[PDB]
Design a protein around this ligand. Structure first.
Ligand code: NA
Length: 129
């Protein structure tokens, strides 16, 4: 499904992403905005044959199994299709392990190029959280 801005922020907050590892909620909403346009069904193919899935575009090379990325790992121990549900639970739990792996939110290229160093607080503005 296609989340609204404040709708997504509320779902992420109740799933414990606000200030997770120091990253305020605005960073996550911004990341989702430019990775998937708030669409849980978004997919994108990469050059190496791997695929990015879901609202946060988590990559099959490392984090989920999609059965067609040879030599990949399944570090979130889930099928990549589980990242496309309208329930963001699996995506959020997997994102939590990605941000914890030492490189923070730099794992998301769109956050680094389009959210890092900006006023990310503007993305939860006006929302009732
Ligand atoms: Na994989």
């Amino acid at each position: 499904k296609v989340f609204g801005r404040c709708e997504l922020a509320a779902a992420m907050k109740r799933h414990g992403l606000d200030n997770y590892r120091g990253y305020s909620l605005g960073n996550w909403v911004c990341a989702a905005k430019f990775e998937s346009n708030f669409n849980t069904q978004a997919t994108n193919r990469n050059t190496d044959g791997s695929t990015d899935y879901g609202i946060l575009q988590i990559n099959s090379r490392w984090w989920c199994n999609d059965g067609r990325t040879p030599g990949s790992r399944n570090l979130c121990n889930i099928p990549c299709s589980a990242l496309l549900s309208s329930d963001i639970t699996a995506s959020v739990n997997c994102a939590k392990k990605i941000v914890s792996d030492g490189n923070g939110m730099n794992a998301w290229v769109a956050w680094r190029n389009r959210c890092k160093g900006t006023d990310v607080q503007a993305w939860i503005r006006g929302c009732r959280l």
